Design a protein around this ligand. Sequence first.
Ligand SMILES: Cc1ncc(C[n+]2csc(CCOP(=O)(O)OP(=O)(O)O)c2C)c(N)n1
Ligand SMILES: Cc1ncc(C[n+]2csc(CCOP(=O)(O)OP(=O)(O)O)c2C)c(N)n1
Ligand SMILES: [Mg+2]
Ligand SMILES: [Mg+2]
Lengths: 821, 818
Amino acid sequence: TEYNSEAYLKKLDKWWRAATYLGAGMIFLKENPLFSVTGTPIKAENLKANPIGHWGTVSGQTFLYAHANRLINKYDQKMFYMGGPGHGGQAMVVPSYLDGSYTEAYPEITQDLEGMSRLFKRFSFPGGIGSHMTAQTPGSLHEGGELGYVLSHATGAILDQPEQIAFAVVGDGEAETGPLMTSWHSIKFINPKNDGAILPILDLNGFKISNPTLFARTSDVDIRKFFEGLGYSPRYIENDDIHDYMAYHKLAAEVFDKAIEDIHQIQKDAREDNRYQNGEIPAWPIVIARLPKGWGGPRYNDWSGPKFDGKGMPIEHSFRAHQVPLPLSSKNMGTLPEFVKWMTSYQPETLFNADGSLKEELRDFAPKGEMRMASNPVTNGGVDSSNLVLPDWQEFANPISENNRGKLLPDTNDNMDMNVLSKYFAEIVKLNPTRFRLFGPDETMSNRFWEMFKVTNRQWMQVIKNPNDEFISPEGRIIDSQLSEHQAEGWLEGYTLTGRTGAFASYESFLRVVDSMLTQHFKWIRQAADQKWRHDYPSLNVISTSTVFQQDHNGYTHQDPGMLTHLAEKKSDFIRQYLPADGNTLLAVFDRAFQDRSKINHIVASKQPRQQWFTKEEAEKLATDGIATIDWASTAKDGEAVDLVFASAGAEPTIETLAALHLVNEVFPQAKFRYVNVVELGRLQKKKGALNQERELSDEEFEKYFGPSGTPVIFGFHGYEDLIESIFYQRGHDGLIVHGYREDGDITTTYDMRVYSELDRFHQAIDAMQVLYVNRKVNQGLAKAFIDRMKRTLVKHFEVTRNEGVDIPDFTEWVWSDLKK
Amino acid sequence: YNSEAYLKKLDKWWRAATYLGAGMIFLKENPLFSVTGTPIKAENLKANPIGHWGTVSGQTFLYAHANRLINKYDQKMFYMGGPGHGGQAMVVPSYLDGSYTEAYPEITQDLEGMSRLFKRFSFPGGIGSHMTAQTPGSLHEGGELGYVLSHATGAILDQPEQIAFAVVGDGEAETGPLMTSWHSIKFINPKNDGAILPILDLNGFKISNPTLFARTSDVDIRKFFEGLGYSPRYIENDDIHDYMAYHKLAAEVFDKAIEDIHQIQKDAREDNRYQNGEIPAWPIVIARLPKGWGGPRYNDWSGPKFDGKGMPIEHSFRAHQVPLPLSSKNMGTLPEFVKWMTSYQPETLFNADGSLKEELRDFAPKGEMRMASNPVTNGGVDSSNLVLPDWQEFANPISENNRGKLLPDTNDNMDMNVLSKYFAEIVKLNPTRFRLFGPDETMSNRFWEMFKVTNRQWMQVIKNPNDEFISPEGRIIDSQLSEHQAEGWLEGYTLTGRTGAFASYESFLRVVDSMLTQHFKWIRQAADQKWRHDYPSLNVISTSTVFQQDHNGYTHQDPGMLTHLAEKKSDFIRQYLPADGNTLLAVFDRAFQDRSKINHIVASKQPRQQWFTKEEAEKLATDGIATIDWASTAKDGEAVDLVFASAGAEPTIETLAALHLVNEVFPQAKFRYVNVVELGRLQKKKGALNQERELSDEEFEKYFGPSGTPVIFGFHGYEDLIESIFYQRGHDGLIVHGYREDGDITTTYDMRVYSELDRFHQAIDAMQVLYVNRKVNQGLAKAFIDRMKRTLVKHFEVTRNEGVDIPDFTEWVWSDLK
Ligand SMILES: Cc1ncc(C[n+]2csc(CCOP(=O)(O)OP(=O)(O)O)c2C)c(N)n1
Ligand SMILES: Cc1ncc(C[n+]2csc(CCOP(=O)(O)OP(=O)(O)O)c2C)c(N)n1
Ligand SMILES: [Mg+2]
Ligand SMILES: [Mg+2]
């Protein structure tokens, strides 16, 4: 009863207004924050010249934040705040400022007049703090700039964290996005026996930037139908008199009380009785809060513009409240009277002392210590942020040696790199039963994670109908049963930022559905690295498999390897892209990836049976150094001059480049060349701008592999050719002869997909012989006879593939053999 | 059309189409083996069967019932397959009604043409597995799932007589884009637009999983769709093999759906209903058609057993792709294939010569009523470009006196607002064939003039004055916060013959990176089909660019779209970076006249200096590049000490100011300035379909001089794109200045210093290269460089102390060179 009395709710109301007062003031003022309490009227010099920030969403989110604090203290609940409308950065900064966590992160921002003035001036100021809930914000793991991912992130955050609740505010405009709409299905994968809970609040403030919202103009009856159809239990916070603030507080206290209690009851039944393990979906609460936009701020634009019913255009309860609600500035003080009236309406003299500190009677409202949402270790790298316990990856390595390199192992499944990787992943689940997860979009089986299903199932909460279904269970370390890349990526990001490690595998082309989500995750960890008070994070591991050259049953629309270019443009110090050519290298790169911190790890991996090349010693070197000269594939020994260099990155390119130099060496053993296998592609760059040099090769190391400028380089690449061309310009190295994907392909045979882009051995061999002849390193008779033979083979390729639907033995039957000399 | 006799005719037609769709997975010859009395041998079978089976029979069921509707109601309609991986479900229906032969005369409706089609399916040099542009009647390949309803909506916008028969996969229904595309009916006005007839193909499974909606109860499914404003009707049965029961029930449901759609359209067009906030109760059909319907039931030949039977194929995910291991190298399961294929009773469906039985030939529509012949599906009923006004009528009066200066009216210095004058007039000249799309950003992006001629289309209740510029009828669609919707609508609007534009914040346009990929692949593949008509171009605008974020920060900074689209076949991509308003006007005059392109325009919305006359603007938009004499001390193809070049508004401003600083102290330096608008012309990529607009080596040297000529290049996007271009051209000496992934909430000109794009860093590089090239003396260079450094020293101090920029930036105006 003590957390439900009107005396207590009036204290909450004051704390609420205290937070909203500061959030509003820092939009316009850079000093003199308590002008009406300290008896110092506003002067032009106190005002910002170009006020920046958002107002509309703020007061509604601080209302919800205040009520979240009440729940924490009343129920002793571990909880954290996630702001869907992240553009209202004040809704997280000042609540942290009021409970002392902000000062703990920023000692100079003290809880007095000096520190308050310092905070006002830093807000949305050059070199200060942003307007959004960036990593500068204590308690944030979600910036909310690019809208739509707050619920998928919240789900990943509460997976395997049974004691945590995610207090997730969803903007009603945000609710119109694709990712947000489908993220409501997340409760079909949350098992209350082992996982925490998300408490979603739909912030139905009625408007977005310039429009009303589709859900706000949906009736409460239809809103109920929508959420009940998805398995939720909707409860409503609304009132006919929007300024009877105490009426909202009483109702919010009732609704939120039953929301937590129903969540706890759901968790009790699942953990003590074993409920919800038979296909029953818990009736998870969802709170629909109709809190008018710009709540408690300017009501009408009376100072300019047209009139309606003797008043200016409405600001409160309209889109016009979204950003800066007044034209006030140091250059335009016309609306200063309106600002003073607005700011004093909060009664700041009842909220703050003259010395800037919060009134004594309000200091016990917020939680203390780690119970504060801004201090919850979930929001600062996770309660436990340690890396995985890894087994020795060599226990799952292929037995490659000098005598079977470049050949197919007897068990076809061992020639499938993804399947070999699943062996390693399967053991990791055994060693990390609660802190490792695999995510996919209905592709884990198609991507050949076959060993994973020997140790776990896909987590699936709805009814199960074996044998029509397979490898699904209410408890599972894999989450794969929703067809949405946004979901898989959002879950992984939330899981990763909260201290755990996982992997998200997808068809290569369709991982680009999530191009912008990866951008945002890079942005976050890059900014988080600049915060000395923040712990680092585990790395985000995304796998591009079923790649351009391995989409047999799916044609041209499943071919886009451009993710390599997209991520190569970010700061390299936070990006690690790996193109292992075989299973042993793939195992070795993930041993490294799983130990790296605050990275995005992008691995391009093969799933179809392919020749295996490198010993587990060679694989270790390739994964550690990321690049290497392969002596058994080279005719030029250490420190020798070369006529050209062969290099490749990727499984298919490596097979074809190795085959090309073999074909050349068969007729011309005198040609001197090195073969260089490229795994860590970022090592080759030399970009302008800082935070790109951590792994870039020195000029000496680069020349050791590719020789001096002018050295021809036959470079087989998995992705688009522009990325390699930019690299060799950055390195000032003329002579690159790139062979990558050229946006050509369709339904065809395995090796014709390589001929489509002229990546194949025969087109590469021609270019190699042509440059040798052009450089007068070989006589014309031999050059012409060889090139004619390569051309004859390609003619046969086109006849057999179009007439028979199979590849020629020149491709299919080839195995590696020692070079001549 | 409801008699048992007619429905048995429909059932035979259905089994005939499904028989061929299944057979072409495995056979390349002898397609009617049981009718011609020629049992299957290994040489008749494909070596590596390719394709999908699970989804087809359900889609051919729906296609057949769609044909019934067309004939019964005389309805103009077209098919859209969400699960596009079952391409035969659109190929074979087209083959049976003659439209396929009209497109491919060699694929005749006889035994020979039938064998030819079997061999072409999913074969090297044949046709694909999906509903590609090779498929007559398709405007939606369905490879990347999730956009069938957004495309369907755009297709029926401004086409009141058309119905989009759009089938939604139940796995596809789990994606973000589809889930939110259900909101489209909040923007369809039955008074002026067509109708979508969506069918949720609840076959129960996707690749390897059951589906979330299939395991949702019919009661909850009803709650879901009624909450979204639809009227759900169900097709299901307890006995999944009582095919005539499904036919009867499907006929009732589909009849009632068409009639309810027509009643909605009549009430809207005759009585004026649904103009006051009432959303029509649009029908949505929930069809529980088992996956692998009518095919193999259990994997009796291998694998584990359950209840004395093999693992289920029908009514399971195992039917998704190739349901048998049969092949020319593995004939073990030929009996299962023969039993499966003969179960359709092909002897009752096809004649021995391969032709379709006579009693079945009258089932499908004829002529343009066939969904495969509907002009909607081949470039649109009307595919003409917009009628355009002379863009010069909205140009700024730029001349030698006011170049490089702010016009007195601040709104004329904002290119997007100037563009909105042009778009507003286009609305008046094309009231039913031009539309503007945005994701709650049209006003934010400063299309202010558009709102004086039209409103946003919005079907729910309106509450003025709290609302603004929304109406049940409007040429703008902007009131849904979803890039997937805006892009999907535009794509459907475009492929069906109309033209529009989609404007978005630059960094958030990348939400639909993959959608633009799919549209490019489509128009490129459509170009390879000689029977296919052209398309209008897809116009997308990237605004609020990286160097124009005031109220937003680092998360709104990503100009990587330029690189993404530059990697596709450049013959279908046009990227323009106009530096001022007059160029932007001229670019869209050209963009709106191009065919089968993606036009990506990077444009400024904040007030900036204006540079080019309407004569220069025309030349920049036509040639895409030009040497600017008044910013040059040397001519084209003439010797120079270095070259200045830029692409974009902010980069052009700083590069122009940089060369001005050099010439100000050292007018002896000989250089030309080159403004770059059509960036793709500078490329020289390997691979075909990239050469149409590429500069010749002679043209490239005319602008940038020979290899070794230093080139100070200011660029809007990431630097690697320029570096790749100059490697393709073998041109040593590039000194690129682009976005370098550095930025934050800061001042206008500091966003440029963050990446060292500013004039002062550019001037330093320019003087440094002259010194290394021994065309200047050390004393002059260091005094200049030290001065440049000193100016940068102050820049860092003022902005961090006051929150405003220094007069060295804000007060600079263009003046004549020496
Ligand atoms: C995917 C995406 N597109 C566009 C934007 C630009 N944007 C920022 S805020 C906003 C309006 C958000 O409305 P709402 O979610 O209702 O927040 P609130 O009403 O609390 O301000 C938009 C469209 C964005 N953030 N994300
Ligand atoms: C965005 C996206 N992610 C993944 C895929 C890969 N994929 C192809 S088919 C398929 C299953 C689709 O199932 P459903 O929608 O139920 O169609 P059905 O075959 O059952 O008719 C998937 C996941 C895809 N095409 N698009
Ligand atoms: Mg809102
Ligand atoms: Mg399905």
